Amino acid sequence: LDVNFFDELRIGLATAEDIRQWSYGEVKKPETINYRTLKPEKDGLFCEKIFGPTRDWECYCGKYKRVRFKGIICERCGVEVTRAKVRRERMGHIELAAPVTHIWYFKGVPSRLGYLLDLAPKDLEKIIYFAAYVITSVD
Amino acid sequence: KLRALKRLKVVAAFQQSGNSPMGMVLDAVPVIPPELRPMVQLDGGRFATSDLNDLYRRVINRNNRLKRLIDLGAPEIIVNNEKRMLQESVDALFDNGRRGRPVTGPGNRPLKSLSDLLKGKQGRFRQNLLGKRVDYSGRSVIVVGPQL
Amino acid sequence: FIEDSEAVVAVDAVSFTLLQDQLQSVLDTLSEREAGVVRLRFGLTDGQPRTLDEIGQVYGVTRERIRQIESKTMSKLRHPSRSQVLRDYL
Amino acid sequence: SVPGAPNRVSFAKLREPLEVPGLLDVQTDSFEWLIGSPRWRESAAERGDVNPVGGLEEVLYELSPIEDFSGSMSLSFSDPRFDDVKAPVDECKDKDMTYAAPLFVTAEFINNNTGEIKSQTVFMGDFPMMTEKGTFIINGTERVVVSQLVRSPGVYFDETIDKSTDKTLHSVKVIPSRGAWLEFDVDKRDTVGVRIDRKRRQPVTVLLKALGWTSEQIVERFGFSEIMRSTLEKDNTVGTDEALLDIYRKLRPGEPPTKESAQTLLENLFFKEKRYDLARVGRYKVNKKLGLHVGEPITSSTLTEEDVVATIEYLVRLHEGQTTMTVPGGVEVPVETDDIDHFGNRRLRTVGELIQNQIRVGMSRMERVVRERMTTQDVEAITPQTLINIRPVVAAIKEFFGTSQLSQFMDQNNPLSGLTHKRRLSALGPGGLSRERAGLEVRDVHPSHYGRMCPIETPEGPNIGLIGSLSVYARVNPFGFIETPYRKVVDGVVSDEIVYLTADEEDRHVVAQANSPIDADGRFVEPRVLVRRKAGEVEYVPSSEVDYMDVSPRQMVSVATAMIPFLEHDDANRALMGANMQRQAVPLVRSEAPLVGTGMELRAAIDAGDVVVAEESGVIEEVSADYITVMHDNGTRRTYRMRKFARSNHGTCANQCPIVDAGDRVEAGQVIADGPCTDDGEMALGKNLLVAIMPWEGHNYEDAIILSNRLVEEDVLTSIHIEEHEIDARDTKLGAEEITRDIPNISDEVLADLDERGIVRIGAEVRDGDILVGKVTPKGETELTPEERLLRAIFGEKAREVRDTSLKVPHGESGKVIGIRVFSREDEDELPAGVNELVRVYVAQKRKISDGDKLAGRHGNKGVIGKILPVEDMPFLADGTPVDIILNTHGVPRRMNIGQILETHLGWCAHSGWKVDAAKGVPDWAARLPDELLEAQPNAIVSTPVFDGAQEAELQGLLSCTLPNRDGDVLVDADGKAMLFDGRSGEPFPYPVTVGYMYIMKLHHLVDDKIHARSTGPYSMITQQPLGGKAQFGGQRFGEMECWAMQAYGAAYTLQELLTIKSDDTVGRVKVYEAIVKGENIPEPGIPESFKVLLKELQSLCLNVEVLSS
Amino acid sequence: PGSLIDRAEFEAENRRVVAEGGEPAAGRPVLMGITKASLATDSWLSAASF
Amino acid sequence: VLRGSRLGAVSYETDRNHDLAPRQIARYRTDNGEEFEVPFADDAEIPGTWLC
DNA sequence: GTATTGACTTAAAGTCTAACCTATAGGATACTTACCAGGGACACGGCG
RNA sequence: AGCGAG
Ligand SMILES: [Mg+2]
Ligand SMILES: [Zn+2]
């Protein structure tokens, strides 16, 4: 907004809840654009329905247009009709079918995951990359 | 005591703050806005990817394939291999070449990952934030003027 | 090495701003009803263009009167007097 | 020597035994070897006719025969043969098609069981060919393959000292071609140890027992040293199978150890050619170093256990401190450490070697696809034509000649630049040192470089030492090493027999120096003759019994450095800069041969290839400004066609004009039409200018130059620059682009010159912004704003639905329009896919010298032009002749390039002419002057060869006798200084001034290409901060150092302004433009866009970054 | 223990701790380097960009 | 310059916050008890299922 | 000049029908494990 | 990749 209301800049871990709170959708298909019409594809990496329209103030089909329909979503394609520059601002999120570990907290020596769990870096690398089992509970 | 002390520089951090130690393990991977990884129709129609859509495509392909393999019902060998591949894909997305050979693209060159954008003299912190190109500027050869 | 070909070029932007300003002024020169008809014909006032019938309805006059006054407005604005203040923008 | 040449008299006191070689041989001879031409066949047969095999023949022979896993059938290649080139050289250069020739190889398929042979030519592909000028033509462009300097494969022994013990520990590194390194290192502990493929060390006895040695045998061979006995004792490995098991467990862990994969493991790793090819040079080096198979020819580059055993024995003997070893059945060799930078270990991969290696990679790929398909090949249904896929080979060749770093864009600023781009040895590239990984010991000069590589000519940027230039007389050994000629001096008697020695052979011989006086009987006229020895140390000398002598002076300098007169009076830095700056001189319109030059001018021009030379003797039948027809001595006649006003790669002019009349008889090899920078056949890079060496009013301050206006009036420093603009109408979604004079919305004034068909007419002057090619691409339906629709109705127009993408003279350019080259699909001309037309317009401008342009002499005395004075306020000699240039005296003494002053003096003498007064004999200072130099007519060209030239005493003498200009008046006293009159004040300067004639060149750093400015323009894609570069409309980088300087000044507001609204903030940018244009205050700056880009990048790294308000 | 803490903050914590029960945390001066002293700053945005 | 484009386009149209089309926020509920508002325009049937 | 009606033609839909893309399935001899730097600092495994 | 200034 304004560089006077910029008192602090905090950095911290982003939990899965934060990641899916930033997101305006979920990229579910590994597609970018149409080969022939060269337009953003549905649910793809460049999806217009998630990150906004490629052209200022239009839905994907063309039903709603112009500033007069600002803040609306076409019911056919689902694109919100607003400025295209929001495509530089809105994020998505992929819902992993299985959990993964952030590499920065595993490989970066000292292995912070290892120090937290007291697992040797070799052991952590074996567990995480499915080379050796590990016991998580014992009655 | 030395190993104990080093471990208390990471075990204290997750205590002093109300941060969970869970943020290390991901269930969702954020996807950067598309125009920060543009796909541009260069002159001649030849499209130019962003080198990050490839890593994201790999992640999404492997995630969807994992979903389908779990849905069908597959032996633990194949599903565990798929999970390892998904872990490697997310690793390559966040940092190429940190573990194993870097993921290479066409021409046998490493794929510019999501962390290479920040590190180095050609990274973002040093090539586009502290130093920038400016308008209203020119350059020319200098010649002595003693009458000035 | 690739130029964003869809960035505010910062010269056409000021050109458009001054174009709107001078167009508004030259419109204010002509009679008020004339200004209104041309405005609501091209949707300058709020970005919504309409045809003869709508303007006839809103002013409670048959379509044909709006058409006629529109023709007179175009003829007036085309006069060399109010064209040199609007050329170099097309 | 050359039939028709300018008579340049020389101050040379030494006769040259060897004529300068075929300076371009480095490229053409290597390529002829690769092809296997009859010329190379004869040259090799003269010197080793045992096994003349070309590069392609070698590749085919190594590849063939091939068989499948079962060996039921095999394929072979033979008889490579080239067809005639597809198109002539000029046409290939014109229409953008590669200058290549078809390659045919006879295949042969033998079904080993059934017993059928099937042979047929296979058309391996369009092999690019080398033009007679030693250069390739690829995609119309002119390219040069620069030789590469690489570490020669072989065995290298090193010794170091360990801090923790302070003991001399040695090491060896058998370095193969595409093998696995075996470094038999010796540690501080007294135990030798192997390190196979860089894997966790081993005791050597383990490998020996892996080779099947018994401990009794091991002590029988490596028994003399205590280190070996210690290793056997502490090894603990008992048994051959134990050693093999341990070796396999260490080399390839994770797989179940066996006996089969323990033995064949090592056998395949080292002693099978599949994976450990040493190459011919590598095996020859190993044999010579260890003295194993000196007599026998070379074949089967793969190793033998004997080689490894001998390497271990040599390392151990070296550690003990022995001097020589005699391997059983091998000649004894001296035990000593190797130097990696010695030119007995740095070999040249010439153009032939690089192209052959790429052919080899492509053939390996083709071989692999052949083998893979052979399984799925129906027996008896297959022929070599349908079994061979040439695509990998042609793909490898094409990807080499383009985008390979050793296939460089030909550097043609002038003939010298092209000639020196050839004969260039770069120590970096594929399989070579990289600038970052290259240490500081490879960049230095080694004693072995003398005569094989120039110590002076070298880039001065971050490439010093990695790129050098081959010396004048240097030659390349068939094995890739660089040889240099020497005169065999026998029994103290110098001879003429010129032996070409490589660095190794030179070290073993006590080689003398070129300028050693000879008594005219072939014998040295003095004891104490200067000499060099093996260690590179120049020191005192054993009189008599010196085995070799330098062929001539200047043997150590390259072609570019051989054209600097008075080189010996210049420091290495200034000589280096002069050499690197001769190659930047632009071709002037006229070109004048220097008054003071060398013997290399004529040969350099001839061998550069940009000067036309008659092929055979004959009488010029008809000469015109575009061609020369010559009638040969026997009936036939030949027409040489000049290349008029052609554009070089770097934008300069390539004009050729004849220098022969319509009746002259011309002999074979005679120059008949000078090139761009040539005058009467000899190279001419600049102009001779009357120079004063005084300081003048602070305008020639700090290496700045002030030139008379005569140089702009008479047009002596002026260069034609031709610039090509390309535009291609393509096929787009909305339709196709048209090239016509119907550009939308643009008036009938800026559509004036454009022809009936679009593209501008020839000879039409165009200034920056004018239209060259009128192109119109479709727009597709869009949304005209209400304001613009109203305006169109008021002014009665239509959208036209087609945008303009016309080609325009880019900003800051101008000039006429030489010619238009139009390629079109409709006329069936090869064009890329999806383009209908491609038009190129050539725009020529005659640049005149102006302040900001860079000038230089040949002695590193560079400088930009600060001012161009009128001729009237120019110092003029007492005669009235104004001086043309004024250099500063403050730059001579400290830069240590006094040679320029010498040149100046000599130049003046050459300009005036002289007569030594030999009334009573010859003056003592002129006794050793060559005859006929005692008298020179005015304006007499002279030469001072590099390291034998005009001694200072001879120059003093010639300066004393300087026969008068027109009346009896010597304008330059014996001191060389003239009394000058002030142009402005009018009074004479109180003291004489050093005046003469300096030959100065106009470097290609013209201010017209350097000026740039910007107020607003394109902005980069992902970030703002506008594009950089004069080519775009580029903003000047404001880096971190500049920002620190601003912070130190305390100027916070200017820094914020710069980094926010001038660069990145996309909302405050148009706002500041509005404020400036409307007279309002510049607005408050916002958040730079790059910071939000950073925030999104951090968040996408799963880092929750949030900007807390407070 | 082994933590490198700024002297000003060290004194501030000592002042905060003398009251409400005094447990003086003894410390010893250290000479860092320019790189270590820079990367130990309290601002991650400058250390990261360094 | 290579002069690329992101496709799409720009549209300078004076931003208005005063006279705006009427909207009817429609609430949807996913399986995991998560509500989600969606500002659809009144002149269109509110769909019965939304990919939230 | 400004108030109208009665025709008189026209582009934009709005829609039905046809072809040309698109998501998807299948294919039965037998084939079963791929492919040259240094210089400093910190951390992990062996050995004493 | 070559190249310029320090
Ligand atoms: Mg300088
Ligand atoms: Zn829509």
Side-chain angles (χ1 to χ4, degrees), chain D residues 405 460 467 584 854 862:
Chain D
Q405 182 195 159
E460 39 182 328
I467 298 172
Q584 280 160 38
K854 190 159 164 185
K862 66 184 156 176

Side-chain angles (χ1 to χ4, degrees), chain D residues 771-805:
Chain D
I771 287 189
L772 304 176
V773 166
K775 188 159 135 296
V776 56
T777 184
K779 181 178 49 175
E781 170 62 3
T782 59
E783 166 48 30
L784 303 168
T785 63
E787 292 77 2
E788 195 176 303
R789 300 193 314 236
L790 181 148
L791 192 58
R792 297 229 169 247
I794 265 54
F795 280 116
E797 286 199 7
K798 298 179 180 180
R800 284 281 290 230
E801 77 165 87
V802 288
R803 21 183 286 190
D804 91 3
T805 38

Side-chain angles (χ1 to χ4, degrees), chain D residues 17 421 530:
Chain D
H421 202 84
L530 205 52

Side-chain angles (χ1 to χ4, degrees), chain D residues 1005-1043:
Chain D
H1005 289 291
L1006 316 168
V1007 67
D1008 326 298
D1009 303 318
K1010 262 59 202 156
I1011 184 82
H1012 174 63
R1014 180 204 225 270
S1015 82
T1016 299
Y1019 296 92
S1020 89
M1021 199 77 225
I1022 293 114
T1023 56
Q1024 283 54 20
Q1025 320 179 3
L1027 296 188
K1030 151 71 161 284
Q1032 296 89 63
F1033 216 76
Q1036 291 313 314
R1037 169 87 184 172
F1038 195 73
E1040 65 182 7
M1041 292 189 87
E1042 296 82 56
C1043 162

Side-chain angles (χ1 to χ4, degrees), chain D residues 899-1018:
Chain D
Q900 63 181 314
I901 304 304
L902 280 285
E903 182 208 349
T904 299
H905 294 308
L906 182 48
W908 173 260
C909 297
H911 166 255
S912 291
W914 61 82
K915 279 178 50 52
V916 194
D917 185 302
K920 55 198 184 74
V922 297
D924 302 7
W925 61 262
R928 64 211 71 81
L929 251 185
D931 262 10
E932 158 282 318
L933 259 173
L934 282 63
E935 181 175 40
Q937 283 324 90
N939 219 309
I941 45 176
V942 303
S943 76
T944 69
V946 201
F947 285 97
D948 89 11
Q951 309 325 320
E952 70 208 38
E954 301 167 10
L955 198 52
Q956 164 155 29
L958 291 179
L959 200 55
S960 165
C961 50
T962 201
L963 62 99
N965 51 3
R966 158 161 46 179
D967 66 358
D969 187 296
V970 172
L971 300 171
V972 185
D973 56 23
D975 282 29
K977 307 204 295 210
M979 193 98 181
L980 269 172
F981 276 34
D982 184 6
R984 298 177 162 177
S985 325
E987 273 86 10
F989 292 112
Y991 316 107
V993 174
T994 282
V995 84
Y997 271 75
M998 192 176 279
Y999 175 91
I1000 86 158
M1001 310 167 308
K1002 175 185 167 181
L1003 269 48
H1004 193 184
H1005 289 291
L1006 316 168
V1007 67
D1008 326 298
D1009 303 318
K1010 262 59 202 156
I1011 184 82
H1012 174 63
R1014 180 204 225 270
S1015 82
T1016 299

Side-chain angles (χ1 to χ4, degrees), chain D residues 24-260:
Chain D
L24 280 178
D25 269 10
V26 184
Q27 303 261 289
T28 179
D29 269 10
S30 176
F31 195 81
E32 288 187 322
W33 159 82
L34 169 62
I35 298 327
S37 308
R39 166 164 317 265
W40 163 84
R41 292 231 197 265
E42 296 178 78
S43 186
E46 148 196 311
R47 184 191 330 140
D49 83 317
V50 62
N51 58 2
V53 315
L56 279 171
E57 307 168 11
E58 153 172 359
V59 168
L60 270 39
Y61 286 6
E62 301 326 309
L63 209 59
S64 81
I66 173 65
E67 77 309 349
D68 55 348
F69 196 90
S70 64
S72 166
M73 59 292 269
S74 69
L75 180 60
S76 159
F77 304 81
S78 34
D79 315 332
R81 61 193 194 71
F82 282 101
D83 254 13
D84 54 50
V85 289
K86 281 144 71 56
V89 201
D90 43 358
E91 148 168 352
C92 276
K93 206 144 69 195
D94 174 17
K95 295 191 261 230
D96 304 0
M97 43 161 164
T98 294
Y99 176 82
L103 165 61
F104 290 128
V105 176
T106 325
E108 192 145 279
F109 191 76
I110 324 180
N111 203 358
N112 320 326
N113 51 359
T114 70
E116 275 55 56
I117 66 184
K118 310 185 176 163
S119 67
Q120 44 174 178
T121 55
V122 189
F123 180 71
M124 298 302 173
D126 276 330
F127 202 74
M129 281 303 207
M130 181 185 288
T131 56
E132 62 295 10
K133 285 160 215 309
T135 171
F136 300 86
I137 305 189
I138 305 297
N139 291 345
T141 81
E142 188 88 352
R143 295 193 157 276
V144 168
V145 184
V146 295
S147 312
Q148 193 188 34
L149 273 169
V150 299
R151 203 182 31 187
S152 177
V155 57
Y156 296 152
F157 294 102
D158 183 349
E159 68 163 308
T160 66
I161 40 178
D162 199 358
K163 269 162 104 156
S164 40
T165 61
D166 194 348
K167 282 185 68 173
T168 285
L169 64 99
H170 299 252
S171 56
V172 47
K173 298 168 65 173
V174 183
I175 297 158
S177 307
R178 65 155 179 91
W181 290 37
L182 43 153
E183 322 166 20
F184 315 78
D185 159 42
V186 177
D187 213 315
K188 58 215 191 306
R189 280 89 79 85
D190 275 313
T191 181
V192 290
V194 178
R195 156 162 21 190
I196 293 118
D197 200 0
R198 321 211 173 162
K199 294 276 277 297
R200 294 323 306 139
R201 278 216 93 190
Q202 277 306 104
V204 197
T205 62
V206 185
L207 191 145
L208 268 293
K209 302 264 278 171
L211 301 191
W213 280 52
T214 82
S215 296
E216 315 58 34
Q217 292 179 304
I218 290 145
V219 303
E220 164 267 1
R221 189 69 172 288
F222 330 123
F224 44 71
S225 86
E226 91 80 31
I227 311 105
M228 286 317 305
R229 285 170 190 152
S230 166
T231 305
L232 277 83
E233 186 175 359
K234 307 192 70 170
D235 156 31
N236 162 71
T237 304
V238 287
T240 87
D241 257 2
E242 209 175 64
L244 261 183
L245 166 64
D246 306 358
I247 288 297
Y248 188 18
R249 176 167 34 191
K250 176 157 275 148
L251 290 173
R252 297 168 106 174
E255 37 267 55
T258 69
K259 293 304 112 193
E260 286 67 6

